[PDB]
């Protein structure tokens, strides 16, 4: 049947240990990281606390993993506050390649009780054909980066 409306979609849950007040509270103008030392120290200006409108926003996650630099390229499509989403569209020419678009949508909220959450998966992307798609890709990304941010959050205070 293949992808009839080449629009395909998969849809996963990650379970995190991390809080979700505790993942929503990056969406606020305090996540621990500040320039000290700094009388004046050239490097660029630190990437701090999100000024960039919030949708629309185009940060970078860079971080090393396995000895490999790995970078996220990303635009905030949409956000709920009161929802807790957030709506990750791909700008990354590298996989407009095998997508024509790649839209993933990430809610991180209360589920088996308390403190446990649940972080939804909700991926949308447009095949360009079908042998040129390959879903085994964004599940791995989608793990990666879960592990991550559920430790990062946890390693901080």
């Known amino acids: ?4 409306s080449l629009v395909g979609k998969l849809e996963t849950d990650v379970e995190i240990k991390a809080s979700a ?5 990056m969406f606020a103008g305090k996540p621990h990281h500040v320039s000290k030392a700094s009388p004046g120290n050239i490097q660029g200006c630190d990437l701090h606390e999100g000024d ?17 630099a790995k ?7 949409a956000v ?3 929802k ?9 020419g590298d996989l407009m390649k095998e997508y024509k678009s790649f839209l993933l949508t990430i809610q991180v ?10 972080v939804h998966w909700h991926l949308e992307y447009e095949k360009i054909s079908e042998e040129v798609a390959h879903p085994e890709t964004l599940l791995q990304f989608c793990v990666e980066v879960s592990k991550e941010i559920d430790e990062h959050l946890l390693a901080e205070e």
């Open 21 to 25: 007040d505790k993942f929503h509270h």
């Open 71 to 77: 970078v996220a390229k990303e635009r905030i499509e």
């Open 52 to 68: 960039w409108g919030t949708v629309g926003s185009i940060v970078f996650w860079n971080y090393v993993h396995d000895g490999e």
């Open 84 to 92: 807790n989403l957030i709506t990750f569209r791909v700008i990354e």
């Open 80 to 82: 709920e506050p009161d």
């Open 109 to 118: 909220t209360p589920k088996p009780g308390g403190p446990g959450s649940i």
């Open 1 to 4: 049947t293949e992808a009839s």
